[model samples]
Target: QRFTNRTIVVAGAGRDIGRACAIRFAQEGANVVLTYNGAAEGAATAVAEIEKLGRSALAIKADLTNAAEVEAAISAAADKFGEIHGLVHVAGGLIARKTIAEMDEAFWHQVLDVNLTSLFLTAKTALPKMAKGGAIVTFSSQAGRDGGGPGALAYATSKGAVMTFTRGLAKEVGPKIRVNAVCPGMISTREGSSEDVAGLVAFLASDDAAYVTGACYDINGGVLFS
Candidate 1:
């Protein structure tokens, strides 16, 4: 139980990898605060599971791209659990498959808003509520490293930027709050399970990764050389 009595905020815990991270943290003895965009049922289920683990949990519906909502969500977490110990930012997606030439400006911006801006908002809002020993784990992807498959230009671009953000944030907040990222391949549309990613995320957010910062760890199965 690396995080016994700690409180961690897991953004996008409504499903998949994000959901797994939430439950995994709870199992490790952390009180959890999870945010879901629209998956209320999934969020509720996560809260229930955490409570069963004898850990407290809160589920909030938040648009990570919206500054006000993001602030509100962090405030809610602080209200419920006092100081935040960690943040696992897993609230992003490809949205759709569309090549650069096939996508309009709105679609392009929407992709960044979800995959990038959300990170900015959530991290910024949570930082104030986090203690000096806190950690932040971000989600990038193999697509971000190798520019992804067809129709994934926008998504890949945003994810690649997430790497940049993780590095920069670490430098800006280090020796205080550690920041890192995980790049997973063959997930969702491929051959990996959310629990696999959750394990990596858990390690990064735990005391085990105390010396790790500004690093993006890859979890792809022979898909990339990085």
Candidate 2:
């Protein structure tokens, strides 16, 4: 119960990495306000799992790429939980797999909007509601640091932007509100191994990481530079 009495807003809490992060926070006794982009059912499942951990959970649907909707979601979370102690920007994906020459401007914008802009929008809306001792964790990719593989031009670029986004935000809101990024590489959600990802997220959100801020903890199993 490292996070007892704390509330966290987890954007993209419906599937994959987001779901894992939400459940992990729940395990540490944090109330979770979970947001889903398209998977309403998955959000409900995540909420149920959080409840199973004996933590309060609220599920909200919002297309985070939309600034207004992102603000509304943050407001809703604050209204429901009274205060937000942490935020996890987990709403992003590999939108398109294309080489630099094959990728269009639209493709690049789309991925950047979700993976990078959404993080800024969510923080902009939620930060005002946060009290002292608040924390935030955003998701980046190993591809961002190491460059894309084969045909992941847009996705890689967007995630790279996310890294700098974390650093800049940490500078802007540090010592009071710690901001960090998790760079996960080749984490498989299949075969029930998602718990591994969840564990790392839980640790980062716990007091165990109190002195940790503006850091990008790599969670890849030696896939990026190895």
Candidate 3:
């Protein structure tokens, strides 16, 4: 029982990566609090699956962009359990693939709010609840490293900022609460799955990575070598 009685919060746990991360954490005996913004059906499925594993789970539909909503979700998880030991922030996306010239201020703000600001809100809200052996893991992308695809300016920019954010938080939290990020590339390819990132997240959250923090591991199968 690696995480028995421990609580893990997975943001955007409706589908794909978020769902996979929640399932994996549950498999390792962690009580999961899953949040979904756009994937209600998927979130329901995930909630049921975690229960099937005999692990407790709470499904919360929350918009991470909203600070109050994010705060509420964190408080609920704490109420369900005693405290939060792990926070896997998988709530983010490249809402629109617009070039700098094609991107409007509104669209730009939306992208950053979702992909970057949400992380800040989550971490800020969860910071007080964190314990001595707590961990926070964030999701970044190779786009953060290499600019991004032709029309992925906003996505890349948000992720680039995420990398720096991870580092900064790791230093701020220090030896008590370790913070880290993963820049996953081609997660659906060979030896890559959403669960793969989940496994890394679990490791960082566990005592095994007690000395490991402030790192952004790249899991792209050498596609970008970033």
- Estimate candidate 3's RMSD in Å: 2.6
Note the Cα lDDT for every prediction shown.
Answer: 0.86, 0.78, 0.83
User: Which residues of candidate 3, in runs, are more than 4 Å off?
Assistant: 187-191, 221-226
Sorting all predicted structures by TM-score, with the top scorer first, yields 1, 3, 2
| lDDT of candidate 3 at residue 97, scale 0 to 100 | 65
Across 1-226, the per-residue lDDT of candidate 2 in tens digits comes to 6888899888986556677777777877788888897756657777778777765688788888888888888888888878788888888777767887887888888888888888889988999998687888888878889886777777788889999988898889888898888777763322223466566666777788888888888774421221
The lDDT leader among the candidates is: 1
Candidate 3 lDDT over 1-226, as tens digits, reads 8888788899877546787788888898888899998746767777788888866688888999998899899999888887789988977777766778998999999989998999999999998987777999998888899888777788789999999999999998988888888888752316466767777778878888888899997774321222
- The C-alpha TM-scores of every prediction are 0.93, 0.90, 0.93
TM-score-superior candidate, 2 or 3: 3
Candidate 2 runs further than 4 Å off: 187-193, 221-226
| Candidates 1 and 3, the one with greater lDDT | 1
Lowest-sum lDDT 10-residue window in model 1: 217-226
Candidate 1 lDDT tens digits, 5-58: 899899977556667888898898888889988755767777788888776678
